[PDB]
Amino acid sequence: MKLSEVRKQLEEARKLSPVELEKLVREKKRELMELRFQASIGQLSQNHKIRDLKRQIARLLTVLNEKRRQ
């Protein structure tokens, strides 16, 4: 997404505990599956949202992997 929103996403993710982080990823993964459904019926005009959520999930798992590895 926008570069400032990535930065804010990383500040907030880093204030989350591993349990919060897992629960967020589980939520964003659900929304990603919702995006794939929508895109498969031709309903996702804004297809950039699929990639954005995928990288979001990557950042969150990266920070989750950070917090179990200081």
Added chain:
RNA sequence: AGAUGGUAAGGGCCCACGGUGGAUGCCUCGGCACCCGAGCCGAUGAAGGACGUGGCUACCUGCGAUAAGCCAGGGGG
């Protein structure tokens, strides 16, 4: 009576223009040689692979369910 020509189904030689074919010249993202530099990787799972991976994705490249990418530092504008 005598004699000499017009005939071209087709063919031959030459001239013109085309078709085919891809020589020659020019060209080079490639290659060759020499020199110099530099020289190990791997159970912390190598080399090399299979299968995946993009909103649309046959192949190649990249990457690995965090999947043409994730975090940070440096360069750059």
